[PDB]
Amino acid sequence: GDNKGITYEELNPERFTLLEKGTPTNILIDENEDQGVMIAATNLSEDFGRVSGTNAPLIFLPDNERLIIVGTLESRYIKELTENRKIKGDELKGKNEKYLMTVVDNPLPGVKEALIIAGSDKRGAIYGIYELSEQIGVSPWYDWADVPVKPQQNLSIERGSYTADEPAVTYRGIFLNDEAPALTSWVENTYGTKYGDHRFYSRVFELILRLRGNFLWPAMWDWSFYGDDPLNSKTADTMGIIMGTSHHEPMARNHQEWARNRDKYGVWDYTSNQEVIDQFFREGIERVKDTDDLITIGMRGSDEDNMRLLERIIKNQREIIGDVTGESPEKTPQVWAIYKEVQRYFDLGLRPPEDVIILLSDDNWGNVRRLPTEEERDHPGGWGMYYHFDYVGAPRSSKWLNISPIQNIWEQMQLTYDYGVDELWVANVGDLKPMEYPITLFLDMAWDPTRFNAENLLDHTRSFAAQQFGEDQADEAARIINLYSKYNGRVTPEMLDRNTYNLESGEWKKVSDEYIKLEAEALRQYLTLEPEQRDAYKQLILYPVQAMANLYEMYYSQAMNHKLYRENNPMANYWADRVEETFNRDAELSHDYNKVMANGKWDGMMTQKKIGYRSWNDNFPADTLPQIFRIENPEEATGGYVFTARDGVVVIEAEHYFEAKDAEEAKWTVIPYMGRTLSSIALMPYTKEVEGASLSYRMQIPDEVSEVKVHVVVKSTLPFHDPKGHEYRVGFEGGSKEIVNFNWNLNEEPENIYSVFYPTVASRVVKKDVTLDLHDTDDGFYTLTLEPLDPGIVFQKIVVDFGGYEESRLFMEESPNKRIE
Amino acid sequence: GDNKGITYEELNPERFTLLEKGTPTNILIDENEDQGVMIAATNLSEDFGRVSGTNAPLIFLPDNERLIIVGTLESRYIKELTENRKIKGDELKGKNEKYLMTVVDNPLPGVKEALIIAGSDKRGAIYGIYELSEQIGVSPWYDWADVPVKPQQNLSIERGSYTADEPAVTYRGIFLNDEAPALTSWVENTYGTKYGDHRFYSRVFELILRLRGNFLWPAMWDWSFYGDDPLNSKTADTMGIIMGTSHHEPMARNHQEWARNRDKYGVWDYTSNQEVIDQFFREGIERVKDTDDLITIGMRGSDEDNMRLLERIIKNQREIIGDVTGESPEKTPQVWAIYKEVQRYFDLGLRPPEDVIILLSDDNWGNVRRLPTEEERDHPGGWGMYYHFDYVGAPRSSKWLNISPIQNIWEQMQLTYDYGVDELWVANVGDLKPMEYPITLFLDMAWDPTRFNAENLLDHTRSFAAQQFGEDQADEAARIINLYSKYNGRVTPEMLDRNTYNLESGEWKKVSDEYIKLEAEALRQYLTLEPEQRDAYKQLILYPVQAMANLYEMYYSQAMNHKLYRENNPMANYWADRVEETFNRDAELSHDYNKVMANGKWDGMMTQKKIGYRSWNDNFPADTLPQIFRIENPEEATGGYVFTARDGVVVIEAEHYFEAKDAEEAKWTVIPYMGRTLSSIALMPYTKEVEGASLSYRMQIPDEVSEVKVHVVVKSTLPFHDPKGHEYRVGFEGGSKEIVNFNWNLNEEPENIYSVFYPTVASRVVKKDVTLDLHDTDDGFYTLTLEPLDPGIVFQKIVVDFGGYEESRLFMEESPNKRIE
Ligand SMILES: [Ca+2]
Ligand SMILES: [Ca+2]
Ligand SMILES: [Ca+2]
Ligand SMILES: [Ca+2]
Ligand SMILES: [Ca+2]
Ligand SMILES: [Ca+2]
């Protein structure tokens, strides 16, 4: 985490041994230490168990000659080292959330050598403990993304003095929100509770602390953090998480505490229900009195009368705080949120009391609305920013996957920090998963925005990947995380549909093929992993990539189906099938995530519907098959194709004729897939005469064109029946025709054998061209005919060329066309 | 194989039980049966072992009341059933290679019920036995492609009478050729022999017989089938394989028998060394006297004197055959090959004796050169066709993978059969692997070409896939086999290079992305397989697909590297890296095939070099890295980009400026990957004034253009500093400029909030356009400048539009450009 390259997998005299032949060195702690530090030290002890197979013993007396000595500045053992100048206590005293990690010789009598982890306060000590956890190899995501722990037999750590200094943002954390159906289902499946209890939140707290955050807004759609379980707040307070509430939840009451008793409580109008709402406020403050939770103040129900009533609500709330806490209101931390109604009041002069944090919000889509000017930056209480990775509302909700590329988060948050907003940073994380990477980035940036610039963003992603998957996997894993996040930034999954990208220009095909290419790369990486890494890889990379590449292909296929159905081309049916198959594959992938991956550990987390949005909300029953169209009796829907020119050319796959007239006995037969592109078409069988047979093609050409060059691509058939060679006649109906002999020189005569013969047969095709004058027509429509004059001619592709011809192995993209009857 | 849907996985009173609760029914055979039939029956007995865990007992007396009774028409038990009209003996007597498979009640006294497998001759009986093998689920490829056998506890087979009738081609088989280094290395690794001995060939024979072929040309570059091991011919003769030799190996002597003693033997000129060469011929015929091998006749060293000497050689060879065999020469089967020199002699009238098969050849690339006319079809000896899946020679060798799509094989071989060529079909198969599928198709077609037409080719591929991988895998496995074979038909791997496909038109990207998409589909299928199917899938599908998709991407990357290096664009370095990585991946894939897959069983088979061809032959040391180019000091090779218009537009990724002038303090900073396409560029940090800063772009426009529409795409930044909004100035240097305010209406005012505000911020970008008159310039070069007037403007993309603009999510493909200094 903080300090890279200081822990080694083998021992050394000038390094400090953390683990030797499977035996961990013991951890010394003051048995009366802050309990949250003790919990973290117990987690560290188990972290040594995950590494080596045996927990590091947690002792209360220096029984041993080598020790890991942990604690706060005021615990008995740490206090003794600072007093004896064995540790630079000045670097910690008065500092916020800071640790000092260093090896010292003879720290205590009877102890020869120790690693010291001293915190300026309880969170500083917890953070230093979790730094050691990451050194020995336990990712913050070891539980919440199943990131396995590499087993070890020996670990040593370099001497030196290490710290993360102080955090740059005072309160750094997350907001569980948009939490139904995913997080709520997962909690009910895991804990049996239709609410979040202290078991669930304890698990959330440990993750936030390991990530070095300190702050949480709890889930509140249909839950109440404070009311549902009395141990919720007690656990948060003990463990070291600062709790808060969102914008319109004043005075440490969760919204649902009012809603669940809306009939008993009244109006929520401060003018009529004033003493009912005052008592509401008071009870809340009483619940939190000796915790350090952040208190939202204010309220949302003429302009000057509104500004006055809000002024009264606030100073009323602050006398209630004074009353309950028994000390002046500024001794309790407070936050006041700017929303639309009160944004006007602010610009007219309205400010909270100056010790109060003023919380700003982004636009629900990751862009900051408003930042302090140089005159407003003065505000002694400072400023907050609320940022979205997930949103329910306009113009359409995004509830499914990560949509927040790393560049976007950084670009707006670096602006936020440079304008002086550094008291509170809190991110809407949805159900938490699958926002694991943007959460890590956002908290790391809140710790020290200074270490992030444009040139080094991806270094962060790389270190993240090396932590989750090992050095040897990190470059490629980070590349894929960065690139899929970028793709998801182009358009949310919920707003992606058949019309998002340009079909005719090739843009749709490009972005669909490129997402599938990303999937192929993720699959190759997946196959190189050890089995114990697969679930973490699926959660962090493979499922978002596979689900998005499948979703892109579904809508790309739908647009392809609609285009071909309009054109009356039976190929629409193939694309209808692909829409069905990909749509079902979406259900297969999320079934795997919920039920099979990690033995169903995350069942519930991936139940959000995403296919079938018609408005902004997800109030449709389930994932729904995108509408598709089918051509009845397709194998009889042939011929009748008419082409329009495009870019100085008409390019024609040979089976898309207008009409075909057969021979006596021999019939035009298309050979599916044959040749370089669509197919081949030939008179079958090769034993009958071809007299009178023909293929004809209908095409529109701009009347400005007076002569064309016709290219005809056929299979490199050799002259098996007659060494004169095969000929066919080619020309426009009512105009000039020429006869082409395409293989007279495909033989082993000395002048042919290597100059032409072996070159064209190894290529498998023959291209010939004639130049034909274009006679005048009233409508611009022409009929090109192909009359074979020998048996066995396999026609494949035609291009009539009047400027736009491009040399190419496939003979160019087919021009626009339609089918008739 | 022959009869589908007649074997069931559970028992039934009206079906015949082959396997019951793990116990197989016994196989009755005449203990004095033809030994090759006995070997096949022993293989059938072991096939029941692979299915159920216990071999079917092979007995010589009807000890049991239910039996599988097998044998030739003249074996004692079969002979008794035909005599008692229990079997329709008339349907078999006189017939060639035909079996009858049918359930009969009370076949023999003491036997209540039996499945009878009666052959018209030894191969007919062997074929009927192997039909039952496929019914119970043992693929012909169970050994040669590790196709696993589904375990069973119960099998029953429907009553009825089943046959494959008689084969349509008399001799059907393969030619091991181009066999070094792959097949030779695999044989040395597996058998320790620098030659093919009877252990190796016995394994080849069993495969050919299970595939229902009967013919082999043995490996002969540096081996001698007849001379290297005396059991080679004896095993072929016993087992039932007809042996032959290639065109210029007359009289059952392999070429190397002459070459290894070229100093002792002389000239190989029938005029000078006549009695030395006569004795050569005689010894050969003596070796084969009572086998049924096919004898090549003729010889290759004025025109009328040549036709006379060849006439003399032939009738000389035929008196030698008469002498050795003691019977007239026509009682020994003979074949005479047409090659170039003697093609003239044929058209002047020269024919072999009329009992001799006249062997024709394709062009070494799968196209038939010459077929009999209606007058020549008369030839009583009939005709052969030699067909290539592999070739060493012009214009360049193809030695690595399958290059023969199913459509091409069928289209030429159906022609071959319809013109009366049906005595000998033999395919050059290289090292045999990896031609497994075209071999199966080619032999199946030789058996009965009648059942193949254009509409049903892929049904064959589907049945093949269902046999190797199960019903549930068959559609998808066949789809991939068909599509990769088609791709390999476009250009051989050896002739593919950076120049094969069109780069500028998008064709190269298309075919590279589509091969990778095929790989992604193969990988998804691979993950659904049972572990015991993985090696067969890798051999038949995953390795050819992965190796080709990697090879395509390597050369596509090389062409991309060369284009960007020419343009002096540092992005060439990324593509240089991809060439290196893909080139090494080619070595990783074949290492896996040789050393890891199937525990190294096939080590040697995939050692052919394929990257580095400069001429027709593979006489370079090893796979060699394609040449790539790198730009030194790349992160300082920025700016200086000049664009040329294309298709009525100039499309510009914002970081490709010509020059950038910074502000006081704030500097132009590109944010890699940010936005929808290449990147974003912005003045950093957002706290300093932007006065005087600019980005300028140089572009050439046709002088016919008099006004343009300029689109500028920026990030949807909101007016955080000033609700007036952000502005930038945009215009041409020396011409008109306009000022754009791009976010004045991005707010929650009632007229903005849902009409524009939430729509554009959810899209993350803002596009604005101005219309600017185009002033005259002598050279057609223009400079467009972008001057930001507020902090925090994130520029992303520009398009100057004069006709060619297309609405698109990515704002079109960047126009041609170069970098300067
Ligand atoms: Ca969600
Ligand atoms: Ca501050
Ligand atoms: Ca679903
Ligand atoms: Ca080979
Ligand atoms: Ca015949
Ligand atoms: Ca190699």
Cβ(A203)–Cβ(A416) below 8 Å: no
Cβ(B530)–Cβ(B469) below 8 Å: no
Assigned token pair, B743: 């976010």
Cβ(B213)–Cβ(B240) below 8 Å: no
* Spatial distance between the Cα atoms of A552 and A542, rounded to a whole number of angstroms: 15
* Spatial distance between the Cα atoms of A152 and A50, rounded to a whole number of angstroms: 9
Q: Which domain holds residue B762?
A: 632-821
Subunit contact A761:B809, Cβ cutoff 8 A: no
Subunit contact B758:A507, Cβ cutoff 8 A: no
CB nearest to B516's CB, from A517, A671, A685: A517
Chain B interface mutation, best of A577, A761, A795, highest count of B Cβ atoms under 10 Å: A761
In A, residues 640-669, which contact B (CB 8 Å cutoff)?
A: 669
Shared domain for B600 and B656, answered yes or no, is no
Cβ(A160)–Cβ(A62) below 8 Å: no
Subunit contact B411:A794, Cβ cutoff 8 A: yes
CB nearest to A809's CB, from B491, B504, B794: B491
> CB-hemisphere CA count at 13 Å for B538?
19
Assigned token pair, B584: 């090494």
The one-letter amino acid code at A445 reads: M
User: What is the per-residue burial (b if ≥16 Cβ within 10 Å, else e) of A485-496?
Assistant: bbbbbbbbbbbb
B754 DSSP 8-state letter: I
* Spatial distance between the Cα atoms of B764 and B796, rounded to a whole number of angstroms: 11
* Spatial distance between the Cα atoms of B612 and B638, rounded to a whole number of angstroms: 34
Tokens 């004729």 correspond to A657
For residue A670, the chain B residues in CB contact (below 8 A) are 454
Cβ(B631)–Cβ(B640) below 8 Å: no
Tokens 């529409």 correspond to B709
Cβ(B482)–Cβ(A671) below 8 Å: no
* Spatial distance between the Cα atoms of B304 and A736, rounded to a whole number of angstroms: 48
A810 DSSP 8-state letter: T
User: What is the per-residue burial (b if ≥16 Cβ within 10 Å, else e) of A600-626?
Assistant: eebbbbbbbbbbebeebebeeeeeeeb
The nearest CA of chain A is from the CA of B499 a distance in Å of 10
Beta-carbon contacts below 8 Å between A and B: 230
Q: What is residue A469's three-state secondary structure?
A: helix
Strand B334-337 relative to strand B357-361, pairing = parallel
Q: Is A376 exposed, middle or buried (0-12, 13-18, 19+ CB in 10 A)?
A: middle
Indicate the angle between helix axes A436-447 and A457-469, nearest 10 degrees.
120
Chain A interface mutation, best of B455, B513, B651, highest count of A Cβ atoms under 10 Å: B513
User: What is the per-residue burial (b if ≥16 Cβ within 10 Å, else e) of B201-222?
Assistant: bbebbbbbbbbbbbbbbbbbee
Q: What is residue B533's three-state secondary structure?
A: helix
In B, residues 743-772, which contact A (CB 8 Å cutoff)?
A: 748, 753-754, 757-759, 761-764
Cα–Cα distances (Å) from B615 to B254, B495, B499, B612, in that order, read 29, 10, 16, 9
Shared domain for A243 and A97, answered yes or no, is no
Distance from residue B623's CA to the centre of ligand 6 (Å): 5
What is the SS3 assignment for B333-370? CEEEECCHHHHHHHHCCCCCCCCCEEEEEECCCCCECC
Resolution in A for the shown PDB structure?
2.3
Shared domain for A673 and A808, answered yes or no, is yes
Subunit contact A754:B676, Cβ cutoff 8 A: no
* Spatial distance between the Cα atoms of B115 and B128, rounded to a whole number of angstroms: 11
Shared domain for B688 and B820, answered yes or no, is yes
User: What is the per-residue burial (b if ≥16 Cβ within 10 Å, else e) of B27-58?
Assistant: bbbbeebbebbbbbbbbbbebbebbbeebbeb
Q: What angle do CA A335, A341, A345 make, to 5 degrees?
A: 75
The nearest CA of chain B is from the CA of A306 a distance in Å of 19
For residue B393, the chain A residues in CB contact (below 8 A) are 758
Nearest to A389 by CA among A177, A604, A203: A177
CB atoms within 10 A of CB B342: 18
The nearest CA of chain A is from the CA of B415 a distance in Å of 6
Query: Which backbone phi and psi does B214 adopt, to 5 degrees?
Result: -145, 10
A614 touches chain B (CB under 8 A): no
Question: What is the signed CA dihedral for B385, B390, B392, B394, rounded to 10 degrees?
Answer: 80
Nearest to B142 by CA among B730, B417, B540, B448: B540
Assigned token pair, A338: 């700017």
A805 touches chain B (CB under 8 A): no
Q: What is residue B683's three-state secondary structure?
A: strand
* Spatial distance between the Cα atoms of A714 and A746, rounded to a whole number of angstroms: 14
Of A603, A631, A659, the last residue of a domain is A631
CB nearest to B502's CB, from A491, A792, A809: A809
**B273 Cβ partners below 8 Å, 6+ apart?**
B265, B266, B267
Tokens 């991110």 correspond to A427
Strand A66-72 relative to strand A113-119, pairing = parallel
B309 touches chain A (CB under 8 A): no
CB nearest to B669's CB, from A408, A454, A527: A454
Strand B7-8 relative to strand B15-20, pairing = unpaired
The nearest CA of chain B is from the CA of A776 a distance in Å of 28
In B, residues 164-223, which contact A (CB 8 Å cutoff)?
A: none
Distance from residue B390's CA to the centre of ligand 6 (Å): 19
Cβ(B800)–Cβ(B710) below 8 Å: yes
Q: What is residue B719's three-state secondary structure?
A: coil
Q: What is the DSSP string of A70-127?
A: EEETTSHHHHHHHHTTSS-GGGTTT-SS-EEEEEEES-STT--EEEEEEESSHHHHHH
Shared domain for A617 and A646, answered yes or no, is no
For residue B383, the chain A residues in CB contact (below 8 A) are none
A254 DSSP 8-state letter: -
CB atoms within 10 A of CB A112: 12
**A7 Cβ partners below 8 Å, 6+ apart?**
A18, A135, A136, A155, A156, A157, A158
The one-letter amino acid code at A55 reads: N
Assigned token pair, A590: 């999320």
Shared domain for B636 and B619, answered yes or no, is no
Query: Which backbone phi and psi does A259 adopt, to 5 degrees?
Result: -65, -45
* Spatial distance between the Cα atoms of B489 and B407, rounded to a whole number of angstroms: 10
Cβ(A339)–Cβ(A250) below 8 Å: no
B636 touches chain A (CB under 8 A): no
Q: Is B91 exposed, middle or buried (0-12, 13-18, 19+ CB in 10 A)?
A: middle
* Spatial distance between the Cα atoms of B350 and B314, rounded to a whole number of angstroms: 12
Shared domain for B188 and B93, answered yes or no, is no
For residue B513, the chain A residues in CB contact (below 8 A) are 513-514, 516-517
Cα–Cα distances (Å) from B378 to A661, B381, B420, in that order, read 33, 9, 9
* Cis bond before residue A544 (omega within 30° of 0): no
Count the residues in chain B: 821
A720 touches chain B (CB under 8 A): yes
H-only helix segments in A529-636: 534-537, 543-566, 572-591
* Spatial distance between the Cα atoms of A413 and A368, rounded to a whole number of angstroms: 9
The sheet carrying B66-72 orders its strands as: B58-59, B27-28, B66-72, B113-119, B99-105, B161-162
Nearest to A786 by CA among A723, A729, A719: A729
Q: What angle do CA B284, B290, B291 make, to 5 degrees?
A: 80
B716 touches chain A (CB under 8 A): yes
Subunit contact A754:B394, Cβ cutoff 8 A: yes
* Spatial distance between the Cα atoms of A89 and A111, rounded to a whole number of angstroms: 20
Subunit contact B395:A519, Cβ cutoff 8 A: no
Q: What angle do CA B703, B705, B710 make, to 5 degrees?
A: 125
* Spatial distance between the Cα atoms of A601 and A615, rounded to a whole number of angstroms: 33
Subunit contact B806:A753, Cβ cutoff 8 A: no
A13 DSSP 8-state letter: T
CB nearest to A395's CB, from B514, B670, B754: B754
Of A567, A598, A631, the last residue of a domain is A631
In whole angstroms, what separates CA B341 from the centre of its chain? Answer: 34
Query: Which backbone phi and psi does A492 adopt, to 5 degrees?
Result: -65, 150
**A443 Cβ partners below 8 Å, 6+ apart?**
A172, A173, A211, A212, A213
Query: Which ligand sits closest to the CA of A618?
Result: 1
Question: What is the signed CA dihedral for A389, A391, A396, A402, rounded to 10 degrees?
Answer: 30
Phi-psi region of B384 (alpha: psi -120 to 50; beta: other; left: phi over 0): beta
B517 touches chain A (CB under 8 A): yes
* Spatial distance between the Cα atoms of A279 and A258, rounded to a whole number of angstroms: 12
Cβ(B197)–Cβ(B225) below 8 Å: no
The one-letter amino acid code at B494 reads: E
Cβ(A244)–Cβ(A213) below 8 Å: no
Strands (DSSP E) along B734-803, which ranges?
737-741, 765-773, 781-788, 795-801
Cβ(A613)–Cβ(A396) below 8 Å: yes
Subunit contact B672:A407, Cβ cutoff 8 A: yes
Shared domain for A663 and A582, answered yes or no, is no
For residue A393, the chain B residues in CB contact (below 8 A) are 758
Distance from residue A493's CA to the centre of ligand 3 (Å): 14
Handedness of CA A224, A226, A230, A233 (dihedral sign): positive
Nearest to A420 by CA among A388, A454, A382, A389: A382
Tokens 């979406």 correspond to A586
For residue A585, the cross-strand partners are none
Chain B interface mutation, best of A597, A714, A718, highest count of B Cβ atoms under 10 Å: A718
The nearest CA of chain A is from the CA of B146 a distance in Å of 21
Shared domain for B494 and B365, answered yes or no, is no
Cβ(B490)–Cβ(A809) below 8 Å: yes
Shared domain for A626 and A540, answered yes or no, is yes
Question: What is the signed CA dihedral for B628, B629, B632, B638, rounded to 10 degrees?
Answer: -120
Shared domain for A548 and A597, answered yes or no, is yes
Q: What is the DSSP string of A142-205?
A: TTTT-------S-EEEE-SEE-----SSSEEEEE--S-TTHHHHHHHHHH--SS--HHHHHHHH
Assigned token pair, B335: 């074949």
Nearest to A73 by CA among A83, A61, A65, A63: A83
Cβ(B525)–Cβ(B477) below 8 Å: yes
Query: Which ligand sits closest to the CA of A586?
Result: 3
Shared domain for A173 and A115, answered yes or no, is no
Looking at the structure of chain A, the number of domains it has is 4
* Spatial distance between the Cα atoms of B291 and B232, rounded to a whole number of angstroms: 12
Of A435, A452, A469, the last residue of a domain is A452
* Spatial distance between the Cα atoms of A115 and A136, rounded to a whole number of angstroms: 13
In whole angstroms, what separates CA A627 from the centre of its chain? Answer: 27
Cβ(B105)–Cβ(B96) below 8 Å: no
In B, residues 455-494, which contact A (CB 8 Å cutoff)?
A: 455, 457-458, 482-483, 486, 489-492
* Cis bond before residue B438 (omega within 30° of 0): no
Cβ(A639)–Cβ(A578) below 8 Å: no
* DSSP H or E run through A689: none
CB atoms within 10 A of CB B348: 10
CB nearest to A369's CB, from B396, B516, B718: B718
Cβ(A615)–Cβ(A552) below 8 Å: no
Query: Which ligand sits closest to the CA of B401?
Result: 4
